[PDB]
Nucleic acid binder design. Structure first.
Length: 133
DNA sequence: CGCGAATTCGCG
DNA sequence: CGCGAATTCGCG
């Protein structure tokens, strides 16, 4: 019960905390729909949070009914809660990723959306299509 | 229950 | 040199 007509998001990490990047792809074709170049310091959960909100914004702009898949139960919970509960220290090194997460929380607090946000079940369906690698 | 101090899980 | 959010037991 995979919905092939969907958007898959995934985060790539080199260290956690460490360099993080993300992208969103068409689950069927693998076409890259958006991508964010590496941010020097973040966490996987913060990058997944930003990836899903970027996906929500991308689909909303297009009036799309496609769902979003993410392999991160944590980040899905944070998006539904409209609050990213990261433990990453707030300092000048982490200012960029915190700014982007604070703004993504603000976007969720000021917009509505209909997009279903679904867990990708890696142990049945293999690697999420947006995977890095 | 109120809490500590463990283990587990999926992920990169 | 892990992140977060589950659990499980201990011992009240």
């Amino acid at each position: 019960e995979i919905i092939w007509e969907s958007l898959s998001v995934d985060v790539g990490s080199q260290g956690n905390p460490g360099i993080v990047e993300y992208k969103g792809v068409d689950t069927k074709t693998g076409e890259v729909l958006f991508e964010r170049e590496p941010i020097p310091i973040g966490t996987n959960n913060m990058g997944e949070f930003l990836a899903i909100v970027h996906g929500l914004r991308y689909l909303k702009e297009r009036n799309s009914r496609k769902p979003i898949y993410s392999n991160s139960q944590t980040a899905i919970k944070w998006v539904k809660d409209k609050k990213a509960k990261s433990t990453l220290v707030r300092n000048e090194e982490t200012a960029l990723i915190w700014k982007l997460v604070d703004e993504a929380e603000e976007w969720l607090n000021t917009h509505t959306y209909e997009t279903p946000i679904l867990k990708w079940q890696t142990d049945k369906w293999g690697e999420i299509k947006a995977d890095y690698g």
